[PDB]
């Protein structure tokens, strides 16, 4: 098949759109999927040089991070659980001082390979503080291209039909990072896409497992954490589980890595597991989005069964609107559709 020949190694692809290609968001997403980008689980988009979401980041020192989290990591030899201790609210100025202080700052290093080794060697020591999950945008109001606060995808059908706002999902989140702050192995809520823009600062490094080997990572994770597997049908959604790339290689799980630098977008695709860490003080904005291709993923997403506050989106509106033939069959519980991860 044509889709199977495109990005056959399911390697992370990087795109450099011109201003003209960049303008239409959902069309650019269709385009990168036409090149097989979605096979990686992650893609990088470098916006055109003369594109800017904000004039200056010099006025945000007084921005409140209301729920900073200290990240206590426990484990050894490639397998870790991250526990999140919430600290009292702090401003960006308070945060950046701590981020750059001799205590928390990025170690000296030659190339990324050495910084990555320092990450995996030291991540259970000196628990860092992540300014994660902050409600807001750093985009200026007038910015029409790739505006994370208004992408205009069909995910907008959720609020449109129901009025329901899900923070970070159909609203933007800001993430102020410092050295060694991390994000655990997860796919998106409801196996949605995510967009992630690094406004400023040091890089954010990412790992990704192709959606086509996603179940292979889950099988590994369940074997490594059998107690968690029995408690919850989707324990990785707790976003507590860290697994080093050496551990993935040891068990034959395909994965790729990429480093996002200030000014670049990352796109994660439905069912693409990703994890990563920040190099130093930075700020990222992020939200979820959807395309028609996400819809079967949404329908088949396995959700966390042990927390009451987890994200669940009714699929009803999407199946009625975009799969009217299958609606009654899906309702009778007899829709046997198999997802083909390569297909755009």
């Amino acid at each position: 098949s044509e889709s199977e020949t495109l990005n056959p190694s399911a390697r992370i692809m990087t795109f450099y759109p011109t201003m003209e290609e960049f303008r239409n968001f959902s069309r650019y997403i269709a385009y990168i999927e036409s090149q097989g980008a979605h096979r990686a689980g992650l893609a990088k988009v470098v916006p055109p040089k003369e594109w800017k979401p904000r004039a200056s980041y010099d006025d945000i020192d007084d921005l409140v991070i209301p729920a900073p989290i200290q990240q206590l990591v426990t484990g050894q030899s490639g397998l870790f659980t991250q526990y999140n201790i919430q600290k009292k609210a702090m401003t960006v100025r308070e945060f950046r001082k701590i981020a750059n202080s001799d205590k928390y700052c990025t170690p000296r290093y030659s190339e990324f390979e050495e910084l990555e080794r320092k990450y995996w060697k030291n991540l259970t020591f000196n628990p860092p503080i992540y300014g994660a999950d902050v409600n807001g945008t750093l985009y200026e109001k007038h910015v029409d291209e790739w505006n994370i606060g208004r992408l205009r995808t069909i995910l907008d059908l959720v609020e449109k039909e129901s009025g329901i706002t899900i923070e970070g999902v159909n609203t933007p989140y800001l993430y102020f990072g410092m050295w060694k702050t991390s994000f655990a192995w997860h796919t998106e809520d409801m196996d949605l896409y995510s967009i992630n823009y690094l406004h400023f600062g040091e890089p954010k490094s990412w790992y990704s497992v192709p959606p086509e080997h996603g179940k292979r990572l889950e099988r590994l994770a369940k074997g490594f954490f059998p107690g968690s597997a029995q408690s919850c049908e989707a324990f990785l959604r707790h976003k507590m589980t860290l697994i080093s790339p050496l551990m993935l290689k040891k068990y034959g799980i395909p994965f790729d890595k990429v480093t996002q630098e200030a000014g670049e977008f990352m796109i994660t695709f439905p069912y693409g597991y990703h994890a990563g860490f920040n190099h130093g003080f930075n700020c990222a904005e992020s939200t979820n989005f959807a395309t028609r291709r996400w819809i079967e993923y949404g329908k088949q997403a396995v959700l966390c069964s042990c927390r009451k506050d987890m994200v669940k989106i009714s699929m009803d509106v999407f199946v009625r609107k975009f799969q009217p033939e299958r609606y009654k069959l899906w309702k009778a519980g007899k829709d046997n559709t198999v997802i083909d991860h390569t297909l755009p």
């Binding site: 923070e167 809520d189 506050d309 994200v311």
Partner: peptide, 4 residues
């Protein structure tokens, strides 16, 4: 609903 929920929260991310």
């Amino acid at each position: 609903g929920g929260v991310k």
